[PDB]
């Protein structure tokens, strides 16, 4: 069988943006197998070895003025540049969520009704899902499966709510998302 | 912060695997096909708003290999430790009978970036309409990957995402069936 040892090498250039393009940080990092060995942090201004394995590179790369100069200006020429280029179809990409409410197929403890608020197919991932019982927000009993990233520029999540249903009550699921000017609501009539 | 754009690349010996991609908040923007020497946009429309010179990935990858060689020798040929994947199977949306959907096999937290994934419909291999992504980066430097299978729900069909990785002593099968 194939049992040869593997040897990996990753290179990553991370551009972190705060308040749009107001503050930008470039983080160039090298990883041997699962160990980051050396990096260039625009906040630091030069390469810094992360482990002994990277010491030679930090020293050698810092001795190259042209390289350091390029790395030092990349926050503008690289980060802010590519942000301007991709802004229209990434930062501004918006797809409204599909929202539906139905009871869980579970329903363990008898005289109780576990509600499921399904929110899917949306983008970006930033979203707020809240439950309300007759106009007032519910704090306890609420449970989420968390935000699921589908890998296709789409997200989904389920937010359950344990209840003691009483004829006449109106349990509302509220969803606030960048794709809509006003919150989306789906009611469950108990 | 609010946004992160990552240019991630890698080279793996002795498989000779090379990859070059761009990531936006965890979602791939595009990667470069090293054989056809062209840019492959994650979503078709992206390619109409921007462009990327694929030859640039090929120049970088050559430097990345040379560096891998140097580092391999510098660590006294310390090989990578296999870290097995966490596998989860889910539908991209709530499932309803005879209602088109897509099975998603999420392979996460693993390294090195090499895996064999196959779908099984009632114990048999499925090839129709399946697609997959390239290895995506993680802050811990391990990888993520998605495999998809478009299908039509029914109480008769049962599926399995079969994953093989050097970190797994045996192939891992994640079962899925209509239980809603």
């Amino acid at each position: 069988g194939d049992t040869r040892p593997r040897f990996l090498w990753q290179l990553k250039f991370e551009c972190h943006f705060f308040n749009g393009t107001e503050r930008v940080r470039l983080l160039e990092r090298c990883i041997y197998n699962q160990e980051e060995s050396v990096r260039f942090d625009s906040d630091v201004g030069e390469y810094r070895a992360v482990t002994e394995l990277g010491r030679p590179d930090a020293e050698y790369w810092n001795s190259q003025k042209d390289l350091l100069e390029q790395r030092r200006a990349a926050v503008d020429t690289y980060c802010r540049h590519n942000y301007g280029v991709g802004e229209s179809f990434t930062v501004q990409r918006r797809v409204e969520p599909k929202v539906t409410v139905y009871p869980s197929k579970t329903q363990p403890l008898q005289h109780h009704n576990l509600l499921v608020c399904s929110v899917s197919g949306f983008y970006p991932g930033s979203i707020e899902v809240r439950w309300f019982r007759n106009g007032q927000e519910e704090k306890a009993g609420v449970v989420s499966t968390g935000l699921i990233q589908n890998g296709d520029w789409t997200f989904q999540t389920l937010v359950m709510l344990e209840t003691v249903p009483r004829s006449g009550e109106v349990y509302t699921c509220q969803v606030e998302h960048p794709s809509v000017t006003s919150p989306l609501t789906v009611e469950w009539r108990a | 912060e609010e946004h992160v754009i990552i240019q991630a690349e890698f080279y793996l010996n002795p498989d000779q695997s090379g990859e070059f991609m761009f990531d936006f908040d965890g979602d791939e923007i595009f990667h470069v096909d090293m054989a056809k020497k062209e840019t492959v946009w994650r979503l078709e429309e992206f390619g109409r708003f921007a462009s990327f010179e694929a030859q640039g990935a090929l120049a970088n990858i050559a430097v990345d290999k040379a560096n891998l060689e140097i580092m391999t020798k510098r660590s006294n040929y310390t090989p990578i430790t296999n870290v097995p994947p966490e596998v989860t199977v889910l539908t991209n949306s709530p499932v309803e009978l005879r209602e088109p959907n897509v099975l998603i096999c999420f392979i996460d937290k693993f390294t090195p970036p090499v895996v064999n994934v196959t779908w099984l419909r009632n114990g048999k291999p499925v090839t129709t309409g399946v697609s997959e992504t390239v290895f995506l980066p993680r802050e811990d430097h391990l990888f993520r990957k998605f495999h998809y299978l478009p299908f039509l729900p029914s109480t008769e069909d049962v599926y399995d995402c079969r994953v093989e990785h050097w970190g797994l002593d045996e192939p891992l099968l994640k079962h899925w069936e209509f239980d809603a």
């Binding site: 160039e28 030679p56 590519n82 | 921007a50 120049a59 990345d64 040379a66």
Partner: peptide
């Protein structure tokens, strides 16, 4: 609009 890449730096010895 073109997305611009950062270019890899060679380690010493690899040069």
């Amino acid at each position: 609009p073109e997305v611009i890449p950062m270019f890899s730096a060679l380690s010493e010895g690899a040069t």
